[PDB]
Amino acid sequence: SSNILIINGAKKFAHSNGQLNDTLTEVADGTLRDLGHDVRIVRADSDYDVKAEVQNFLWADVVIWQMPGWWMGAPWTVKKYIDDVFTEGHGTLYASDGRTRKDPSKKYGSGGLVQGKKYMLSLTWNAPMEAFTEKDQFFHGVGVDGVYLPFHKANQFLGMEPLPTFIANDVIKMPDVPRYTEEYRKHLVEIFG
Amino acid sequence: SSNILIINGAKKFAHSNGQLNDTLTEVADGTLRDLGHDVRIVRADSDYDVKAEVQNFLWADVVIWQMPGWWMGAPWTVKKYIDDVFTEGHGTLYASDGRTDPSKKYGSGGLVQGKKYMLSLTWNAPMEAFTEKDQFFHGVGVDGVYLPFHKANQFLGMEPLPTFIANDVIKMPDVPRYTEEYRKHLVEIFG
Numbered sequence: 009s010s011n012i013l014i015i016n017g018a019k020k021f022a023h024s025n026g027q028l029n030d031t032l033t034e035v036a037d038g039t040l041r042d043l044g045h046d047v048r049i050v051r052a053d054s055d056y057d058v059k060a061e062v063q064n065f066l067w068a069d070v071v072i073w074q075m076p077g078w079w080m081g082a083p084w085t086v087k088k089y090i091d092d093v094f095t096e097g098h099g100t101l102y103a104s105d106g107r108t109r110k111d112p113s114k115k116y117g118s119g120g121l122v123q124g125k126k127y128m129l130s131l132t133w134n135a136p137m138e139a140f141t142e143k144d145q146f147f148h149g150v151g152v153d154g155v156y157l158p159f160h161k162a163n164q165f166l167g168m169e170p171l172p173t174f175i176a177n178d179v180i181k182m183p184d185v186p187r188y189t190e191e192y193r194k195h196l197v198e199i200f201g
Numbered sequence: 202s203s204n205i206l207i208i209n210g211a212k213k214f215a216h217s218n219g220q221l222n223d224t225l226t227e228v229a230d231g232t233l234r235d236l237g238h239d240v241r242i243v244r245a246d247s248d249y250d251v252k253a254e255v256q257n258f259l260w261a262d263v264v265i266w267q268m269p270g271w272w273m274g275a276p277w278t279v280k281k282y283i284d285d286v287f288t289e290g291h292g293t294l295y296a297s298d299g300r301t302d303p304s305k306k307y308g309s310g311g312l313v314q315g316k317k318y319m320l321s322l323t324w325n326a327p328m329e330a331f332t333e334k335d336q337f338f339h340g341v342g343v344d345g346v347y348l349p350f351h352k353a354n355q356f357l358g359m360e361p362l363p364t365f366i367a368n369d370v371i372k373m374p375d376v377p378r379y380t381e382e383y384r385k386h387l388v389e390i391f392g
């Protein structure tokens with residue numbers, strides 16, 4: 009029975025209507041609450057109160073980033089949420105980068121304050137999965153999490169740890185909702201069940 | 202004699218005071234134009250006109266991204282520039298992801314093959330954090346942490362040039378050194 013914060017990065021703009029992400033956010037909200045978890049939802053593309061957002065993070069045991077891939081990553085509004093909130097999070101979400109003369113053992117990234125909290129990515133992309141896995145394709149085979157390395161680290165900088173990522177592919181050419189919904193639903197049950 | 206578009210991603214906000222990026226922007230400006238290149242500077246954090254920015258791209262042979270490291274990547278303002286400008290460029294900077302027949306893979310529908318791009322970064326993090334196989338960035342390197350940013354540019358058909366980065370710019374600020382390095386870095390590729 010955990011507190012779950014869903015950050016919906018949905019946003020209507022040039023080809024993206026944000027309907028799929030709103031849907032999946034709704035799928036998470038219902039599935040998660042039915043699994044005994046308390047859920048809070050906030051739209052990145054809104055006029056959020058930065059301090060209240062930080063409070064959402066302190067409240068959350070798990071943070072779920074529901075978002076469409078926009079130019080290989082999170083939409084600018086999602087990045088702004090991070091640049092606004094994590095930064096305001098200084099003193100509560102992180103203390104510094106961790107390095108300290110008092111302990112040469114500590115390296116960059118170890119200054120987080122919320123170790124123990126988890127975060128999970130739920131993505132929607134027009135790109136096929138093979139574009140992520142095939143060693144010879146666009147992403148050199150580094151994988152989805154490879155492509156989202158900097159996003160993962162922004163979160164881990166705070167000390168949070170990742171949960172298995174969920175992604176929907178070819179959402180424009182071969183859209184299939186249901187299925188995305190059913191796979192995400194079972195994905196949530198395996199992790200939060 | 203090349204056309205060089207520098208995108209200054211400098212932005213105040215919190216502990217970042219865009220002076221370093223502003224300075225490095227001028228450094229590349231002075232150096233490159235001195236080599237005879239035609240240089241144009243645009244600040245990401247401005248009231249840019251997407252159509253005008255698309256034209257700057259078609260005009261440029263090389264695009265330089267001068268920017269600080271913000272939460273592991275480009276500041277939201279620089280990403281907004283991309284989401285706005287690259288998308289506006291559909292039909293000029295890129296056609297699609299390349300897929301139709303069965304052969305062309307994702308990321309091969311660019312329209313500006315032949316153009317180049319380079320990253321000029323500023324981070325608080327030390328270099329070892331990027332290279333140490335067991336440190337924060339599992340040894341993937343700077344270009345690894347910026348893989349997506351690289352790919353956003355490569356989606357348009359553009360190719361990368363060697364990346365320049367200044368590290369520990371807060372704890373161990375060292376201007377000059379960054380300047381001389383960058384200057385020497387620019388002369389190497391554009392000289």
Ligand SMILES: Cc1cc2nc3c(=O)[nH]c(=O)nc-3n(C[C@H](O)[C@H](O)[C@H](O)COP(=O)(O)OP(=O)(O)OC[C@H]3O[C@@H](n4cnc5c(N)ncnc54)[C@H](O)[C@@H]3O)c2cc1C
Pocket residue numbers: 018019021022023024025026027028029030031075076077078079080081132133134135179180183185186284285288
């Ligand atoms: C600026 C920009 C940059 C982009 N960059 C990339 C990129 O780098 N890589 C990449 O792979 N993609 C990229 N995209 C595409 C983007 O990832 C997709 O457009 C987005 O993920 C679709 O999600 P959405 O929430 O906007 O849904 P929608 O726009 O609604 O699209 C989802 C599809 O599902 C259908 N649908 C949605 N909800 C339902 C429902 N409840 N029931 C039935 N059918 C439904 C819709 O009719 C639609 O065809 C980019 C898009 C933009 C605007």
Ligand SMILES: Cc1cc2nc3c(=O)[nH]c(=O)nc-3n(C[C@H](O)[C@H](O)[C@H](O)COP(=O)(O)OP(=O)(O)OC[C@H]3O[C@@H](n4cnc5c(N)ncnc54)[C@H](O)[C@@H]3O)c2cc1C
Pocket residue numbers: 091095211212213214215216217218219220221222223224268269270271272273274323324325326327370371374376
């Ligand atoms: C929201 C946010 C998130 C961040 N996330 C990260 C992160 O994930 N990783 C990371 O490594 N860093 C991170 N940083 C730190 C950031 O990368 C640096 O603060 C930034 O790169 C410094 O560049 P600047 O242009 O803002 O210069 P400044 O803020 O001016 O800092 C550069 C230093 O150089 C000095 N200086 C500048 N210009 C000159 C000059 N012409 N002559 C002499 N001295 C000069 C300044 O006085 C200062 O001490 C983050 C910062 C913010 C605000």
